[PDB]
Amino acid sequence: LNVDLSFEQEFQMRVMEEQVSAMSLQEARELLLQASRLLMMKDNVIRSLVKRA
Amino acid sequence: LSFEQEFQMRVMEEQVSAMSLQEARELLLQASRLLMMKDNVIRSLVKRAAR
Secondary structure, eight states, rough: OOOSSSSSSSHHHHHHHHHHHHHHHHHHHHHHHHHHHHHHHHHHHHHHHOOOO | OOOOOHHHHHHHHHHHOOHHHHHHHHHHHHHHHHHHHHHHHHHEEEEEEEE
């Protein structure tokens, strides 16, 4: 499986850096939690695709 | 739809409420990197569409 960022995803990380460096404490905190929840949701998506073995 | 062990989210909420700007920013950036990595995995699994 592919795991590395793509160049273009690597570009998107540059954009995320700039955006994040402007963020307030409150805003960084809530986006981290949103991301944290989304991270778990993707594990579940991965588990289902693999369950389809 | 998160498993019961979404006790993890409660824990995470606790930790995040005591993080500094610098750490919230670093971690957020890391998470965003992981999201794309997981996207890549999901893309590969799907691609295996010999079906």
